[PDB]
Design an enzyme around this catalytic site. Structure first.
Site: not given
Ligand SMILES: C[C@]1(NC#N)CCc2ccc(-c3ncnc4[nH]ccc34)cc21
Length: 275
Positions: A19-23, A42, A128
């Protein structure tokens, strides 16, 4: 404690996008000696308004089954959350399929349902819900994440109408979402049915919602999927799926939102199947 200083957040790696962002994985290291805690951060990549809403939604959610909000860093610049090293459920299921039995899948289903029952109590529509947006805290604990598309329902209206069609893979959308861009807690129930299918196939790519729906399907794919669904066609029972689990998926997939069970009605049924 909920205010993270920019200069102390140390970048480590990319965790994912959506959704046009990154983690990103960062260490909050004010000592500068690599001993600080790991956090998931995020950020964005009108978009600022939807990001601010997402932060306000997550900040007000308090559940063992919803990813924990830690705070924000300002420039709101970044959303800081607890880091779950096991990552997304979709990838976890694929890697540990030979170790997780039906009982464990039923435990995850019940935890997601409990988190969804709590979101509904908050008048929050996730929009989602998919295994890619569920995180693994431990072998016996899952949490719902990514509130990027989430909406809060006004007090006098139980559904929401989106102006433009979604940018998410179409295979989790309810028929009313595919036809009229209508979203509610009942379309979240439809998406949960697809989540149950995802769990019971261990997120196998060969029988995934996208692979299996394409296989079953000059007309656009969205209209072809709606046609498929309006005819009463549904994803098949996953290989070795218990009959009762499949019957619940079919209930979540009722054509009309009003006929789909509630998350409060689903919860005790999953708890009973688990035990
Ligand atoms: C669900 C998603 N987007 C979001 N928010 C979709 C892609 C992605 C990749 C990594 C993580 C993640 N990994 C580990 N710990 C975490 N804590 C909070 C988020 C998170 C979450 C997401």
């Amino acid at each position: 404690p909920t205010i993270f200083e920019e200069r102390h957040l140390k970048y480590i790696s990319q965790l994912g996008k959506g959704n046009f962002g990154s983690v990103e994985l960062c260490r909050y290291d004010p000592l500068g000696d690599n001993t600080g805690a790991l956090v998931a951060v995020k950020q964005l990549q009108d978009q600022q308004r939807d990001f601010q809403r997402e932060i306000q939604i997550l900040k007000a959610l308090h559940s063992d089954f919803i990813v924990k909000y830690r705070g924000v860093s300002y420039g709101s610049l970044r959303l800081v959350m607890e880091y779950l090293p096991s990552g997304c459920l979709r990838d976890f299921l694929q890697r540990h399929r030979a170790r997780l039995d039906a009982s464990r899948l039923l435990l995850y289903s019940s935890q997601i349902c409990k988190g969804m029952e709590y979101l509904g109590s908050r008048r929050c529509v996730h929009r989602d819900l998919a295994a890619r947006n569920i995180l693994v805290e431990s072998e016996a604990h899952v949490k719902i994440a990514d509130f990027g598309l989430a909406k809060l329902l006004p007090l006098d209206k139980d559904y929401y109408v989106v102006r433009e069609p979604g940018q998410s893979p179409i295979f989790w959308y309810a028929p009313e979402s595919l036809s009229d861009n209508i979203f509610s807690r009942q379309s979240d129930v439809w998406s949960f049915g697809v989540v149950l299918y995802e769990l019971f196939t261990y997120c196998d790519k060969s029988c995934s919602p996208s692979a299996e729906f394409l296989r079953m399907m000059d007309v656009p794919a969205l209209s072809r999927l709606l046609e498929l669904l309006e005819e009463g066609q549904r994803l098949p029972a996953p290989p070795a799926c218990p009959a009762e689990v499949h019957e619940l998926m079919k209930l979540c997939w009722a054509p009309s939102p009003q006929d789909r069970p509630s998350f409060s009605a689903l919860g005790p049924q999953l708890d009973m199947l688990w035990s």
